[PDB]
C-alpha cells in the first residue's frame, strides 16, 4: 500500500468504488431509506477491503473502523451523488428527494438541510471524483483511529494523493494547501451529520416506525 504511487492510489480507489443501487408515508420513506442503507452496507464492506492498507489490519480493527464510520460513508456518498441536483438528495437514481419531502419523516428535514448544505459546498468547490474517493477513504481510516503508524502512514499517503491531484490540476502551492484544508474541514461537518443521523435512526428504532435489518441493528448499537 505504502509503495503505491499517487496515480496508482487514485486508480485503486476509483476501481474499488461500490455500485449505485436502486430503491409517500413516514414508514414508507423510512423503509425505503433503511432498506437501501442495508443493501449499501454489504457493498461498503467489499469496498473497504479494497482501500489500500485496510486488509493489513486485524479483523478486530477492520470491524471497529467500519462500525465507527459507516453512516459517515453513506452520507458522503449521498452528498456526492446529489452534487448536480441543487435542492435535492439523490438517494438512488430512481429516488431523488426534494428538501420538503424530508418533512415526510419526523426530525428528518433538519438532517436533510445539513446534507443539502454539504452538497452545495461540494458544488461551490467543484469537488472532483478523484478527490471524493480520497476523502471517503480518509473517513474510513480516520474516524475510529484514536482508539500504530501503518494506518497513519496510509493516511499520509492519501494526503499526498490529494495534493498530487491538485498539483496536476494546476493549482499553486498556496492554493493546494488552502483547498486541502477546505476539503478536510468538510469531514468535521460529515462527522456532525453522522452523529445526528445515528440519534435519529435510534429514535426510529425505538418507535418501531420501521423494521431494521439485523446488520443495521448491529451497526447501530455499536454506537451504544
Amino acid at each position: 500500500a505504502a509503495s503505491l504511487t499517487a496515480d496508482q492510489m487514485v486508480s485503486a480507489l476509483l476501481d474499488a468504488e461500490p455500485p449505485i443501487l436502486y430503491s409517500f408515508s413516514e414508514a414508507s420513506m423510512m423503509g425505503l431509506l433503511t432498506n437501501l442503507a442495508d443493501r449499501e452496507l454489504v457493498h461498503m464492506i467489499n469496498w473497504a477491503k479494497r482501500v489500500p492498507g485496510f486488509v493489513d489490519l486485524t479483523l478486530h480493527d477492520q470491524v471497529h473502523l467500519l462500525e465507527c464510520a459507516w453512516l459517515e460513508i453513506l452520507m458522503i456518498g449521498l452528498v456526492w451523488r446529489s452534487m448536480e441536483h441543487p435542492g435535492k438528495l439523490l438517494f438512488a437514481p430512481n429516488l431523488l428527494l426534494d428538501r420538503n419531502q424530508g418533512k415526510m419523516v419526523e426530525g428528518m428535514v433538519e438532517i436533510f438541510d445539513m446534507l443539502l448544505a454539504t452538497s452545495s459546498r461540494f458544488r461551490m468547490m467543484n469537488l472532483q471524483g478523484e478527490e471524493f474517493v480520497c476523502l471517503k477513504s480518509i473517513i474510513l481510516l480516520n474516524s475510529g483511529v484514536y482508539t500504530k503508524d501503518h494506518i497513519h502512514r496510509v493516511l499520509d499517503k492519501i494526503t499526498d494523493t490529494l495534493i498530487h491531484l491538485m498539483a496536476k490540476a494546476g493549482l499553486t502551492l498556496q492554493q493546494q494547501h488552502q483547498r486541502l484544508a477546505q476539503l478536510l474541514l468538510i469531514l468535521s461537518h460529515i462527522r456532525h451529520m453522522s452523529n445526528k443521523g445515528m440519534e435519529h435512526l435510534y429514535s426510529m428504532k425505538c418507535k418501531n416506525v420501521v423494521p431494521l435489518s439485523d446488520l443495521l441493528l448491529e451497526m447501530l448499537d455499536a454506537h451504544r
Partner: peptide
C-alpha cells in the same frame, strides 16, 4: 457479529 462474517 454479522460484520465479522461479512468481512470473512
Amino acid at each position: 457479529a454479522i460484520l465479522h462474517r461479512l468481512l470473512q
